[PDB]
Structure formats: structure tokens, C-alpha cells
Amino acid sequence: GTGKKEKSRRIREVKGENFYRDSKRVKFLNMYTSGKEIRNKKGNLIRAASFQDSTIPDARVQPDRRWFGNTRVISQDALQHFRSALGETQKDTYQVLLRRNKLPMSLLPKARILDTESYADAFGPKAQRKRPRLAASNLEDLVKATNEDITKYEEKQVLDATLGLMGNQEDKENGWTSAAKEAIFSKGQSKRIWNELYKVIDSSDVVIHVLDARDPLGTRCKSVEEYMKKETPHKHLIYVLNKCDLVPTWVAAAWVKHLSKERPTLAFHASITNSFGKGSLIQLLRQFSQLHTDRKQISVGFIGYPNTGKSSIINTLRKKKVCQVAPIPGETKVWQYITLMKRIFLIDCPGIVPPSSKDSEEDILFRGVVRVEHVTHPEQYIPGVLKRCQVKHLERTYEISGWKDATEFIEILARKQGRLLKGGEPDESGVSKQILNDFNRGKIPWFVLPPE
Ligand SMILES: Nc1nc2c(ncn2[C@@H]2O[C@H](COP(=O)(O)OP(=O)(O)O)[C@@H](O)[C@H]2O)c(=O)[nH]1
Ligand SMILES: [K+]
Ligand SMILES: [Mg+2]
């Protein structure tokens, strides 16, 4: 074994250097076990920990006439040309600027009443305002304006009375109070989850926003996209339409065409055995990899609503079960790094549900956000299923027919499936929960029509 000696190897070709590591590699790998201070038997500190010295530098600034000069200047023509060219370039989401760090990206009347007339002048013990500021031209125009305003106001009260006066006004009239919103519908909005989301975004060079094919606009998070455009514009955002196997092919094609106007969009079907769109996604990520040639590698973040298949997409890319997947929301709790290649990293993130007042509890329940078992009255959301699914699809799925409304549908399904309580009365809550779970998990086919 003379030829395997380190002296012989050095003839053929720091501390710890061998065949598998050179000095640079050894010095880099020693970082993970560094940062510890040195103590002796006497207690004296031979050396302090790295970045932990207690010495006091003499903080000084030397005088120089160059501190006061102009640091950056540009001509008018060059500034105008730069504005035009790069401002036109930015708006395209299919365009990417190379070496964006070294670019000069930072280069990119009603009168006030108060100044002439103060609050004291307008009203109070010391007021001096005695006549209207802008008096009417004459009496007839004033009466015409009053008549027009009264007509408009009466119309407005009639319009908003059909929602408020018949609603909230009568609600408190009888003393009735609507039941408080269930805490289940507020899930996905804890500060832990949003800290995870912001960490993932801050660490991601490219962010993949995952949308469900059946309901892409419903699962799309406008607030996060607006925040990324305003605050981290150098990151790239793309659309991946997951679960395209549930909808018809033409629906997916139309949705991809509609969404590609905003930003690059790929239709995807996440599966370990037989998938769709894996090669296209790999090609796009590779393209982004060559575009960021300066960086050691690029990191890719997956964000979206819960149960959109982010972990499933990562598993499809790895062709392995490297990420936990489950239909129940809240499966992924923290971010997770996956090494797709040496140049590309993937980050798994918990699903986020941006808070919106206009999103009713029924819509959130129908987007797969919440756990169905925790809903109080699952039957009350059953009619919604009836207005999102074709009758023939339900007849094929459950092998039943002849219902007039949701109550009869639930009763017939429960009797057919034998979901009977003690005494023979059907289990309405359990069957309703099963129907909601089946709607969410894709057993019942449904989709939203794409815009014309
Ligand atoms: N039919 C279908 N189901 C999917 C697809 N992707 C994910 N799922 C299902 O959605 C459930 C939850 O998805 P998951 O990967 O955990 O989404 P995540 O929470 O965002 O990571 C799983 O039980 C999957 O079986 C898909 O492309 N097609
Ligand atoms: K999940
Ligand atoms: Mg997941």
C-alpha cells in the first residue's frame, strides 16, 4: 500500500487534507464545527470565539476632499434613454434582466382650503365665516340641485335597503344575533405560517405559485403577488396549474391561455408514477439556472393555498416521497429544503389563506382550506355542492337519482349507503361531511368555466 500514502499521492498529483478533500474544501467544511472559544486549565482564554472579540477599535473617519463631491452623475440623454428602455423592459414578465444588482435600478394639484381659512375662522366662538364660500348662482339652480340630490339619495337608499335594511336592521330588531364565525375557517392565518411564508419568499430566487386547475382564480393569492411586485421585484413569479387531470383538457388549455397573459404558466399533474408537465417544469427551472450564472445556485419556493399539491409537485420532480402529502390541511408546518440538483434547490412551504372579508365561509370551505370534520352544520353547505356539480356527474358517482333538493339527496344517499343512526334514522351530518370531502378530494368532477 505504498502507492496510497499521502506523500506518494502528493507526488502523483492544510491539516485534514486527503484524497477526498483539498485544502479549500477542508477549510470550508471546518465551518460547521467552528465558533467555539478556547480555554485552558487555568481558565485563561487563549483565543475568543469567531466574531466574538471584545476589543474596542479606534473608530475614526479620515478627512478627505472627496467626501463632499458628487458620487454618481448621468447626462440627460442617457437618463432618458435608460428610463425608456428599461421601464419598457420591466413590465414584461417574460423578460429577465441579467446582473440586476449592478444595474442602476434606483434611478427609476387641488389647492388646500386650510391655508387661506383656518379651523378657528370656519367655526367656533371666534369664527369670521358669515356667507357660503361658493354660493349658488341663483334660486332655480339650487332647487334643481336639491331635487336631483333627493332623487339620487332615495334611489341609493332603496338600493342598499335590499341588503341592509331587510338584513341587519331586522336582525337586531328581533334581538337575533348571527352565530359567531367558526374558528376553523380562520385556519392558515397564524403568524407562524406567515413568518414561514415570508422566510420562504426571502430565500427564493424563483417563486412558484401553485393554483388548482378546477378553481385557479379562487386559489390565486393577489396580495402576495402584489407584495412581490412592489417589494422584491427581482424575484421571478410563475404559475403552475396543478390537478389538471381532474378538469377536461380544453378547460386546462383555456385557463393556461388566460393565465399566460400575466406571467409564464405551466399545466401540471403531480404524481410519482405517471405525471404531466414534469419535463416542461424542469426545462423552465434549468433556464432560470443558466440565467443566474453568477450565483452558486438558485432556490425555488412553492406557495399557494393548502392542498394544491406543492409537496406533490416536489415529489414528482424528485420522483420520490421526499415530502409528506395528505388531503387534510395543515400537513406541512415548516419550510423544507430539497436538493433537486447542485444548482437548483426547492423549498416546501405551508399553505397560506390570505384574509378577505368578501370570501364567505362557504367559499373557503369549497376551496379545500378547512377540515370538514370540524364544521358544525355540514348539511347547510350541501346545497352549494348542488350548484357546483352537474346532476349526471352526481348520478354516476353515487348511483342515485330522483332527488328534488339537498335534503332528499342526503337522505337517499344515506339510505343507499346504510349510514343509519340508532333507530334507523339516517346519519345526515356524516353523509354531508363525506360529500364535502368527496367534493374537495376530486371524486366528484367539477370545474369553473374560464373567461371568454
Ligand atoms: N388528482 C390529483 N390530486 C392531487 C394532485 N396533487 C396533489 N393531489 C392530492 O392533494 C392532496 C394534498 O396535496 P398536497 O401535496 O399535500 O398539497 P400541499 O399541502 O400544498 O403540499 C394529496 O392527498 C394528493 O393526493 C394532482 O395533480 N392531481
Ligand atoms: K396538505
Ligand atoms: Mg405540502
Numbering used by the authors: 2 to 14, 24 to 118, 127 to 470
Sentences from the paper on this structure:
Biogenesis of the large ribosomal (60S) subunit involves the assembly of three rRNAs and 46 proteins, a process requiring approximately 70 ribosome biogenesis factors (RBFs) that bind and release the pre-60S at specific steps along the assembly pathway. Spb1 methylates the A-loop nucleotide G2922 and a catalytically deficient mutant strain (spb1D52A) has a severe 60S biogenesis defect. Nog2 is an essential hub enzyme that acts as a key quality control element during the nucleoplasmic maturation of 60S, anchoring both the pre- and post-rotation states of the 5S rRNP (Nog2pre and Nog2post) via extensive rRNA and RBF interactions.
Refinement of the Rix1-containing subset to 2.9 Å resolution shows that GDP-bound Nog2 remains associated with the 60S during 5S rotation and Rix1 complex binding, as the Nog2 active site in this reconstruction also contains GDP and lacks clear density for the A-loop. Just like Nog2pre, Nog2post is not destabilized by the presence of Nog2-GDP, indicating that 5S rotation, Rix1-complex binding and Rea1 recruitment can proceed normally in the context of Nog2-GDP. Our finding that the spb1D52A suppressor mutations sustain near wild-type growth even though Nog2 is GDP-bound throughout the nucleoplasmic maturation of the large subunit shows that although hydrolysis is necessary for Nog2 release, these events can be uncoupled without affecting the timing of Nog2 release and Nmd3 binding. This suggests that at a specific point in late nucleoplasmic maturation, after Rix1-Rea1 mediated removal of Rsa4, Nog2 binding to the pre-60S depends on the presence of the GTP γ-phosphate.
